[PDB]
Design a protein around this ligand. Structure first.
Ligand SMILES: *Cc1c(COP(=O)(O)O)cnc(C)c1O
Ligand SMILES: *Cc1c(COP(=O)(O)O)cnc(C)c1O
Lengths: 396, 396
């Protein structure tokens, strides 16, 4: 039965890693990575995370199953994190949170939940967006359409084309928004633009679905949520798929959550059981380790004080690199203006390099980037900065 | 939406739980659990596992992502447990293993893979079977049919009725077999019956799919694989969904594997690529903690020595309870013959009690069991053996 099965195509982020490895030049650089790296080039385990893991080693007495929705404190902590400590969505018991395997797992579950218990046929994602969005939504058998977003000429948010493309969306269509640190552009709306999309969202009858994977990387844990929180003040319904991969550096333990908010307690409870029904048919119940680690840190003042500092250092290192990158490009004679790079948030950014330029970078120099010209700013260290800027200047 | 979402029907096994922890009267006894309990009535963390987790704490230096298929060593250890140390399947590089979230997660990906890259439309599961098999296969769009298995009268495997209903099955249909310790029955085919089923399959064109969740619980690690291994000797293709939840007490860490085998390596490599695309659109990559613990134990001679001892003790404790159960029933006046309980394997068995008797058993107090009459022998201790039996004898 597997005889005529056709090879699945190679993934971009994934196909470059190898070629990089087997590149085996001398002083090469990987800017196509999808993870955080520190000054030294490694992706360490947060100290707060390691203290939490010792705690668990010493206190876990069983590995008995978790409920389908996972750890309760994990669910409280995230709700507070998203909607804020005093939010009414929480006090009116209007939101229900399920622990899932990663931000991606949260996304697939919302998809299956939506595709089987609702009249949703389409989900609108930005152009561009993390590539894996189309694949998760196509799996649950939903259509994905594209809305404008990025201005390739000016390197900003073409708010107009956005709104103008979002008028084709019908009442009842799902619209996906990146909460902060848009992947891959690094371009996020302003608070006033978030408020405008909120009003437009209820007027048109759209179902907002937020993918919140980088809370804490643009400006702060709280500032990074004004957008989502601006929609939650106005909507009756909403879905949030968040992930703790980047911000707790817990990538391989699959830690995220899919939050459902309805008009009230009875509807979320009724709607959430169908969401639990969808989890049961997929992976049954979620992996305890990462989530226990997150609940433990978020709920101890000592440990949480340390995590916030660690997350702040990551945030600040990234903001250093973006400044030092446009600065070193300038000293090296950089032909063009890369200053827009400092206006964008998070680890990603389109460098505005040409597919053929990216190829030249990888062949003639050791510089590796994704064909879209997307580079991961976290792969830049003060040490490799100079040879990197010199290679890019040589291709402009 | 969400306005008219109808509630999901309470899951049977997960319903008694709350009625149990609501009862809170004297010598309550939950036998509807689906987990192992020792003589203390607790589900401990295997010591071999605690040792592995400390080693991990001290040695991990990153939580960066695992490949879609997970840890390589996990994949190879799994393959040896299933097929044996020198299997041809291994030497010919005919099998590819994906680390997965739980045995249930393996079933789901075998299913999405099968549903998208193949002509399968049907999957046959025994009657009765783990209730969740219909749900996972259905959520993938495959229909599920039932072959006969249990002899309600004689408390055995109706071989003939099984082979007879299986004749309704067409070529290119998936047949699902439980490798050892049939859930909920505990009735497994003999080696001569496995071989008979292996030969009939090759000639009818059935694609076999093994659900192997209790390796090590019927007779031994190797012995429990002889059925799987009789099939693998005469098939070009087959799929195995194994779980390490029960035999490693890693219930909540979500640890399992989906093994694909094909006629040769280029096919399996090509088919596996599509299996990986299915994972990537589900949860992306798998949780490391548990699978690291398993690979670590299975790799080190000292720890594996200890783990095996720990598995033998669980296996021997269950075989002791089946025996003390049918012995304490006899001497307590039980008028029926419960001998078949000793001939069954694993944690479960149908007591052959009517729906009305389980209800009466529980209300008239004490005993909680699944309405099917299914009972978990691991929930019995030498301490509750007498009251349990008194209560069963009082209702026959
Ligand atoms: C990283 C990311 C996710 C997923 O987080 P994971 O825990 O790695 O699955 C989802 N959406 C976006 C936009 C992301 O960047
Ligand atoms: C326990 C079990 C599974 C699943 O193991 P998990 O790791 O919990 O998913 C699958 N099939 C049967 C028959 C089982 O008993």
């Amino acid at each position: 039965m597997f005889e005529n099965i056709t090879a699945a195509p190679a993934d971009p982020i994934l196909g470059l890693a190898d070629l990089f490895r087997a590149d085996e030049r001398p002083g090469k650089i990987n800017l196509g990575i999808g993870v955080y790296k520190d000054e030294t080039g490694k992706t360490p385990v947060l100290t707060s995370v390691k203290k939490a893991e010792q705690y668990l080693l010493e206190n876990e007495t069983t590995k008995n199953y978790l409920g389908i929705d996972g750890i309760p404190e994990f669910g409280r902590c995230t709700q507070e994190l998203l909607f804020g400590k005093g939010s009414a969505l929480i006090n009116d018991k209007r939101a229900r949170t399920a622990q899932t395997p990663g931000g991606t797992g949260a996304l697939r579950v919302a998809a299956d939940f939506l595709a089987k218990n609702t009249s949703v046929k389409r989900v609108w994602v930005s152009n561009p967006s993390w590539p894996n969005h189309k694949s998760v939504f196509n799996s649950a058998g939903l259509e994905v359409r594209e809305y404008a977003y990025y201005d390739a000429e000016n390197h900003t948010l073409d708010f107009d084309a956005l709104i103008n493309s979002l008028n084709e969306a019908q009442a009842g269509d799902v619209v996906l928004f990146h909460g902060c640190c848009h992947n891959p552009t690094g371009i996020d709306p302003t608070l006033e633009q978030w408020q405008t999309l909120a009003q437009l969202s209820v007027e048109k009858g759209w179902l907002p679905l937020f993918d919140f994977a980088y809370q804490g990387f643009a400006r702060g844990l709280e500032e990074d949520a004004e957008g989502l929180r601006a929609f939650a003040a106005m909507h009756k319904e909403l879905i949030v798929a968040s992930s703790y991969s980047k911000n707790f550096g817990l990538y391989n333990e699959r830690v995220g959550a899919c939050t459902l908010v309805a008009a009230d307690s009875e509807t979320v409870d009724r709607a959430f059981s169908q969401m639990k029904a969808a989890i049961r048919a997929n992976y049954s119940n979620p992996p305890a380790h990462g989530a226990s680690v997150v609940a433990t840190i978020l709920s101890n003042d000592a440990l949480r004080a340390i995590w916030e500092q660690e997350l702040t250092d990551m945030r600040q290192r990234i903001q250093r690199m973006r400044q030092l990158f446009v600065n070193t490009l300038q000293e090296k004679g950089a032909n063009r203006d890369f200053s827009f790079i400092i206006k964008q948030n998070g680890m990603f950014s389109f460098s505005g390099l040409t597919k053929e330029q990216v190829l030249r970078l990888r062949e003639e120099f050791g510089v590796y980037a994704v064909a879209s010209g997307r580079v991961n700013v976290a792969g830049m260290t003060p040490d490799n900065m100079a040879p990197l800027c010199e290679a890019i200047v040589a291709v402009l």
